[model samples]
Target: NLHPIGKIAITSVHLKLPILKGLSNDNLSAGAGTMKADQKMGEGNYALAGHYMTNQGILFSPLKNVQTGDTVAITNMKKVYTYKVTTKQIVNETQVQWIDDVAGKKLITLVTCASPTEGEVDRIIVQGELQSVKKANQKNLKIF
Candidate 1:
């Protein structure tokens, strides 16, 4: 079984899925997968990647409707983190600048293909800033 490192949720997009540790096809097929190694929750550029399939209701396809001001929550079952969507845009696959960690910023970057059927030549990037962090509890994490 693929090990899940955490859980990522976006109420605005109806996304509540596992955050697997690897970006392998097998992992992305299951849920969002880690884009960088040694990344911790609520840290600099916590990146995750998912597949954009033809069925818009599943996986990261819902991200297409995600807008600025939306909320994204993630947790490692220890601390629950909340972020406010600050940016959403489409970029070419060659734009790899944001894929790297930035100093002094707690950011969450969600990535997926921009088109349903097209190959991964373009990408949809959604970014958020850490809003709050709270102790993890069933009641506090119900949205996730």
Candidate 2:
């Protein structure tokens, strides 16, 4: 048996009321690819990518349930960055304009395959802005 050695460290994303592990490739058969992995306290958008799958129990399935005004959080060794969901958009796969950096505002974006219910066609993008940043105690945090 062979597989990719897990050398890259993992991070975590908190969405709605629950927390989920962030993974590389994120949409791999089943994990959330955490974009901007090293994005820390004062950087650009923190992004996450995942898949819309037949198995809805994991890897961002709950993202579709997140609504505008809902909360999204990202935590690491230094801080717990908080954001409030501001928009939920459905866009074409070819549409990359939404990736633009939001000047003066700390933000986060989540991407997933849009409805086809069982196919990948468009994109379901969720964006949020920074509300606050609090110091975090990294102990007890799980690595992917």
Candidate 3:
């Protein structure tokens, strides 16, 4: 029901999350799931999921590189939803509570594998809350 509004990039590094349109092992190999389709933009957690490459320079690998107080921004061609990392924790595969919407708060949760296997056994969750928002960058084109 939803499409990618923009790309997800690592602000501090030269890395980006590869997007897999659906949830399949093949898709998982590319990136992660977009269970986000049925969810609202700012209502629930507009989170992104990816895999662990065992390298800090790849897919969700930089989760460890970013810590509390760091920032993550989401753009939708219209506005940029900025989020600030508040906590980093590991949770079991069954703990899916963080993916729900809060009554009146905006948030984002980055989920990736903590192990190399293809199971959600252990998850490296990077949680953040909305901080600030700004208009999306528009190419200022004009006659000089």
Candidate 4:
């Protein structure tokens, strides 16, 4: 069985989707998949990956439009974690080091194909730094 571990939202790009527990085929297609089993919101390098679609509005297609100063928020229905977009780039598919956890840093890394076309070997990486964390009450939850 599969269920959402949390939710990820990038309001500026109108990208909001469920965050699944693992990077299974079903989880990646339907929503974002946690890259590492132990990754947690507002913690060390909480990485997630999603499928890219050609529609420009579905899945992680909108991630391409994200800018360096945008905001990314995630929640588990108990607390809200806000992060400010700090890195945006196109990297080779094998450049998996971007998802590594760093000492003394709280971050979020989002990954997706650079294009929807077949044989796409590049990935769009959008990373952010933890800005704030608040209880997932009505007001704080509005960020997502």
Candidate 5:
């Protein structure tokens, strides 16, 4: 199912093993699940969480390579919300404040463990701003 929260939409995707269990197929979790959702949403500070690796030890490893200007798309309730990467940061695990929502513009924040190697101490955060929304079935919105 597609879930639309504020300006962002989310769905379940395949979960890699060992590191991410209890996560939905679309990469979303409701409660007691591996994933966590922030009650907040809207034009500013939107947030969602997912595991970097799965139960079988698979990883969302590609996320680490995402660069600025790349577009992230979330499809839900027949609408697709598009986000353009603005910045990428690697911060200490205790720096939870970085996850806080920003004011004035719509934001999409993706979080995952940084560096799957042992003794990793940081979190990888990819932040983007909402670009626009389009009908999911619309042909004008080309997805790369």
Candidate 6:
């Protein structure tokens, strides 16, 4: 079973895929490209990227509205990685230092097009640190 990532504090006007689905080949082949799973949880940055203008774009449109102190969560097959929003910045598209690992912490950073119309001008980044993890409970997890 799956649950909502977290309480979306900021809601962007970006278009979401009508169907709940994973990435496709066409999406993966786009310029500068995008990665599927960067990390699952713990001790490193887990990153996700998508075109800002795609019909199924991930971060661009919706991310524009993210504000500080929002909650973003990621649920893995075994546990849920919860994060508390800390920072929001707009940087040039080629600035990759934003994703560098910070000492003594586990975090997740969301990257998307800053100006979707321009396509590669800047990146809108939403960053947060790990808050907690909710493991599978007896009521939710069944074993044979």
Backbone clash pairs in model 4 (N, Cα, C under 3 Å; residues 3+ apart or in different chains), count: 0
Best-to-worst ranking by lDDT: 4, 1, 3, 2, 5, 6
Arranged by TM-score, best first: 4, 1, 3, 2, 6, 5
Clashes of 2: 3
Q: Give model 5 RMSD, 1 decimal.
A: 6.4
- Give the better candidate number (3 or 5) by TM-score: 3
Model 4 — TM-score against the truth?
0.94
User: What is the Cα root-mean-square deviation between model 3 and the actual structure?
Assistant: 5.1
- Residue 19, candidate 3: alpha-carbon lDDT: 45
Worst 10 residues of 2 by lDDT: 1-10
lDDT of 2: 0.58
User: 3 or 5, which is superior by lDDT?
Assistant: 3
Q: Report the error of model 6 at residue 2, Å.
A: 18
lDDT digits (tens) for residues 1-144 of candidate 5: 333232222212332222122346554332112233443323566555555665555455445777888776654335667778898888787887765766677887776778666777788887888888767675623342
TM-score on alpha carbons, each prediction: 0.94, 0.67, 0.76, 0.94, 0.66, 0.67
C-alpha-based local distance difference test score of model 6:
0.55
Candidate 5's TM-score reads 0.66
Q: Which 10-residue window in model 5 sums to the lowest lDDT?
A: 10-19
Candidate 6 residues 42-127, lDDT tens each? 45776655556555444345667777877665543466556787898888878887777767878777777776585478888888
How does model 1 fare in lDDT? Answer: 0.88
- Model 4, range 38-136, lDDT digits (tens) per residue? 888888999999989634446887889999989999999988999999989999999989999989999999999999889999999999999999889
lDDT of prediction 4: 0.90
Q: Estimate the overall C-alpha local distance difference test score of candidate 3.
A: 0.65
Q: Which candidate number maximizes lDDT?
A: 4
**CA RMSD (A), model 2:** 6.1
| Whole-model Cα lDDT of every candidate shown, in order | 0.88, 0.58, 0.65, 0.90, 0.56, 0.55
RMSD of each: 1.7, 6.1, 5.1, 1.8, 6.4, 6.9
